[PDB]
Amino acid sequence: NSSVLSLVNFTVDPQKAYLDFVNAGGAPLTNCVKMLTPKTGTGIAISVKPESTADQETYGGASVCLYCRAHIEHPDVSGVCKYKGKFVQIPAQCVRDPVGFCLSNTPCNVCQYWIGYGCNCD
């Protein structure tokens, strides 16, 4: 873990740094906080309470946030993390690297579902 974290600490684009590292075979960040949930939730991206469906897993919000995990500045103009204090739903085929998934996808605007992973706005 210390390798990729100290790696995203030596660059101006931490998001690109992490993604290029794991796209090149680097080990995803471990110890993301996976919750035990009923697969009953709405299935949205980010939620005050777990909202996993049968195809998702829920993670503690801070633990899947690169900027939280590596103790570096959050890019949000408001300075407030989008994940910390909340829960994040991850497609189950993507649990090998929750942080990589969150760095690579964005929740829709109208609906709060992952674009391409639940957003049916088209």
Added chain:
Amino acid sequence: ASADWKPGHAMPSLFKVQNVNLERCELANYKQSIPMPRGVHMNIAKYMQLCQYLNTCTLAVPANMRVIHFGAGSDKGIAPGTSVLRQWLPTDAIIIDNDLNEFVSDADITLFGDCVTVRVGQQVDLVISDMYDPTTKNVTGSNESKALFFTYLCNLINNNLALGGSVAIKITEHSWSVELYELMGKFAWWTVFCTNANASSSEGFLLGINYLGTIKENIDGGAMHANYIFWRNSTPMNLSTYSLFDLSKFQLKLKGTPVLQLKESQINELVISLLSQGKLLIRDNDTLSVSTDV
């Protein structure tokens, strides 16, 4: 066994009333471990089982619930229990957590440093402690009452805990305090709860349910720890997480417990009864201020 489907075991009055010497703790399955769901830290199950048991207790659950979680960090730099608390508690509850070492968590406020640096300005509603001092593993002589963070926690119960609030404080065979057992006598009810997910450890959560501020039961703390150990030595506990199969009722009931300000003279019997049933908290209703001091 039906007990495998419960979140764990609570010390029965059968052992609370014994009078024995403190003996060594010898668990038949000691340190044996149970696999968890893939990627799920064991502390997820531990905290969830603790929460499931507290779901059967008369917890006061107000709006803007004030919760403080000591020993929330880990050697992995993350905070699984805090996340369980976020999942368990009402959305408008305030979680403040703390640990000697740096970590990141889903709490509202996170304070690094010794718990003695945590200055609680107002009274809180629920204290969770999972603190354990590594030096406790150096077993040299007799197993005596311990100070460490228990001194701080004992003073907290006496000064910074709402009437009607509750505590859940981790103890083990060697990590325990006479004073803290005695203070269980100032709550409407108390027990020691051992999760099934970690039943092979002498760990238990010393629970004080509904703080009353006066002595309901006179407890000999040294003797009570000896009873706790006598119970652990007498009681087969099978490691299990079956209680986590059905999580449909996991969240803490939204009781809307009222918060009242009252002078000591006005407590009388109705209020005492309401506090003992988890139906009332007495404390300030200002803005919570929990910060780190120098």
